[PDB]
Design an enzyme around this catalytic site. Structure first.
Site, PDB file in Angstrom:
ATOM      1  N   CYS A  55       0.852  -1.178   0.000  1.00 13.59           N
ATOM      2  CA  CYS A  55       0.000   0.000   0.000  1.00 13.59           C
ATOM      3  C   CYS A  55       0.888   1.228   0.000  1.00 13.59           C
ATOM      4  O   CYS A  55       1.917   1.236   0.680  1.00 13.59           O
ATOM      5  CB  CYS A  55      -0.899  -0.023   1.237  1.00 13.59           C
ATOM      6  SG  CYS A  55      -1.813   1.509   1.565  1.00 13.59           S
ATOM      7  N   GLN A  77     -13.183  -0.492   3.501  1.00 12.44           N
ATOM      8  CA  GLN A  77     -13.725  -1.829   3.349  1.00 12.44           C
ATOM      9  C   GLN A  77     -14.227  -2.284   4.708  1.00 12.44           C
ATOM     10  O   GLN A  77     -13.602  -1.990   5.724  1.00 12.44           O
ATOM     11  CB  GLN A  77     -12.641  -2.751   2.799  1.00 12.44           C
ATOM     12  CG  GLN A  77     -12.561  -2.660   1.330  1.00 12.44           C
ATOM     13  CD  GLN A  77     -13.241  -3.860   0.638  1.00 12.44           C
ATOM     14  OE1 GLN A  77     -14.334  -3.695   0.110  1.00 12.44           O
ATOM     15  NE2 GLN A  77     -12.639  -5.030   0.659  1.00 12.44           N
ATOM     16  N   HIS A  84      -4.081  -7.610   5.726  1.00 10.31           N
ATOM     17  CA  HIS A  84      -3.675  -6.450   6.500  1.00 10.31           C
ATOM     18  C   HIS A  84      -3.155  -6.824   7.877  1.00 10.31           C
ATOM     19  O   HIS A  84      -3.653  -7.749   8.517  1.00 10.31           O
ATOM     20  CB  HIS A  84      -4.845  -5.515   6.723  1.00 10.31           C
ATOM     21  CG  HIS A  84      -5.473  -5.008   5.467  1.00 10.31           C
ATOM     22  ND1 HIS A  84      -5.271  -3.726   5.014  1.00 10.31           N
ATOM     23  CD2 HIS A  84      -6.315  -5.593   4.587  1.00 10.31           C
ATOM     24  CE1 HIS A  84      -5.959  -3.538   3.905  1.00 10.31           C
ATOM     25  NE2 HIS A  84      -6.599  -4.657   3.619  1.00 10.31           N
TER      26      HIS A  84
END
Length: 145
Positions: A95, A113, A139
């Site tokens: 990211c 999200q 993540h």
């Protein structure tokens, strides 16, 4: 127990631990809703990621299981103290927020999200999640505020 925490039994030790099913964090200690929380995250994409490209790598070719190994290794180095979250996210997060040490700044519900959002608002300040699966990838969320 706070939202998402549940008791479980260590199948190595037999000792009791706590996992959270919203954030995928597990820990030994017994654990302990804001309009806004502030997070950093470390993202590791894979070929089934929504956009399999990142500043790190034009064509991300690693699989979803390989993405999980990497995430787990990073989780291990953060949690051992052999590295901190900011250093790993700068080097290894797929990211572009890696350029800000993972930081995304503060947000509220209805922006991200839903699995990331859920994991984030179910983190206490200073807490780190487990692997958090979204369509972008897996993540590690750190809630900083």
């Amino acid at each position: 127990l706070p939202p998402g925490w549940e008791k479980a039994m260590s199948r190595s030790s037999g000792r009791v631990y706590y996992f959270n099913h919203i954030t995928n964090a597990s820990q030994w200690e017994r654990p302990s809703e804001p309009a806004r929380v502030r997070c950093s995250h470390l993202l590791v994409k894979h070929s089934q990621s929504r956009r399999p490209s990142s500043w790190r790598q034009e064509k991300i070719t690693r699989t979803k299981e390989e993405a999980l190994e990497l995430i787990n290794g990073y989780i291990q180095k953060i949690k051992s103290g052999e590295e901190d979250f900011e250093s790993l996210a700068s080097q290894f997060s797929d990211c572009s927020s890696a350029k800000a040490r993972g930081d995304l700044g503060a947000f509220s519900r209805g922006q991200m999200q839903k699995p990331f959002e859920d994991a984030s608002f179910a983190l206490r300040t200073g807490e780190m999640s487990g692997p958090v699966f979204t369509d972008s990838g897996i993540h590690i969320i750190l809630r900083t505020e």
